[PDB]
């Protein structure tokens, strides 16, 4: 089971961005997280995403975009990739996609997007994992015991961002 | 009772409660607990008679602050604080 995180130019998620994704204040960032796995019963949730000046994801940051599945930033939008008659590239790959609006909060030309995923079970009883919870369900209710359970099986990803100033 | 009142006065090699502060981010890697920064979890250790082991007996919960989206949540996480030990 392999996982990847990629940034795209637009909300069409057609063209993965070459090099270091470059962004300015009030521009959007388009994020796709993916997993190539054999077990159909295996899923994942986007647990937490944040931006930091530090390459180390253990470093604390106050620019939090998603916190425990539910988005914290008001600009977050989720996109479907599992829509009938709406094909996406690479079928063998299961994906979750979202976007956010970049806000000027740091004073650096280089930032890191850090996202952690947690594993989940798509079908009852098959896997030793909690059931998958959508962002909408988590916002209405999600408790500490479930969060602790999800955190037991998690993978973190990091991509750099080049921050440009503009008039 | 192999609790703090006995064990912290009679410091010894046999099975007893041991004091231990844990910092969530620094010691456990639990980044999602906003408050407290840490707490006294303690642990159980020491020799036992006769093949038994020194292990926890009474455990207590810990009140934590975490977030879901922008919603602050306060809850009592069970099984966080070791209060007494037993040979088993």
DSSP notation for A98-126? EEEE-------SEEEEEEEEEEEESSTTT
Domain region containing B49:
1-88
Contact A99, A10 (CB under 8 A): no
H/E element holding A139? helix A135-140
Contact B45, A44 (CB under 8 A): no
Contact A5, A49 (CB under 8 A): no
Can you say whether residue B45 is alpha, beta or left, with left for phi > 0 and alpha for psi between -120 and 50 degrees? Answer: beta
> Would you tell me which residues 78-137 of chain A have a C-beta closer than 8 angstroms to some C-beta of chain B?
none
Q: What angle do CA B60, B65, B66 make, to 5 degrees?
A: 120
Q: Reduced to 3 states, what is the DSSP secondary structure of residue A64?
A: strand
Q: Reduced to 3 states, what is the DSSP secondary structure of residue A66?
A: strand
Distance (Å, whole) CA A73 – CA A52: 15
Q: Between A and B, how many residue pairs show a Cβ–Cβ distance under 8 A? A: 44
Strands B54-68 and B43-45: unpaired
Beta-carbon separation of B68 and A48 below 8 A: no
Query: Nearest C-alpha of chain B: how many angstroms from A90?
Result: 31
Number of domains in chain B: 1
């Amino acid at each position: 089971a392999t996982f990847n995180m990629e940034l795209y130019n637009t909300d069409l998620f057609l063209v993965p961005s070459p090099g270091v994704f470059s962004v300015a204040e009030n521009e959007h960032v388009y994020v796709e997280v993916s997993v190539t796995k054999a077990d159909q019963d295996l899923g994942f949730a986007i647990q937490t995403c944040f931006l930091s000046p530090y390459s180390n994801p253990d470093r604390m940051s106050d620019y939090t975009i998603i916190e425990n599945i539910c988005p914290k930033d008001d600009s977050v939008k989720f996109y479907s990739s599992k829509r009938v008659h709406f094909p996406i590239p690479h079928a063998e790959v299961d994906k979750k996609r979202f976007s956010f609006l970049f806000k000027s909060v740091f004073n650096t030309s280089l930032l890191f997007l850090h996202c952690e995923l947690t594993l989940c079970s798509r079908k009852k009883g098959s896997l030793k994992l909690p059931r998958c919870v959508t962002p909408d369900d988590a916002c209405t209710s999600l408790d500490a015991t479930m969060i602790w359970t999800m955190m037991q099986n998690k993978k973190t990803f990091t991509k750099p961002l080049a921050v440009v100033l503009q008039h | 009772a192999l609790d703090a009142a006995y064990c912290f006065r009679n410091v010894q090699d046999n099975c007893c409660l041991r004091p231990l502060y844990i910092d969530f981010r620094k010691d456990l890697g639990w980044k999602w607990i906003h408050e407290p920064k840490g707490y006294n979890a303690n642990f159980c250790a020491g020799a036992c008679p006769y093949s038994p082991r020194c292990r926890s007996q009474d455990l207590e919960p810990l009140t934590i602050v975490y977030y879901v989206g922008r919603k602050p949540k306060v809850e009592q996480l069970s099984n966080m604080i070791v209060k007494s030990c037993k040979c088993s």
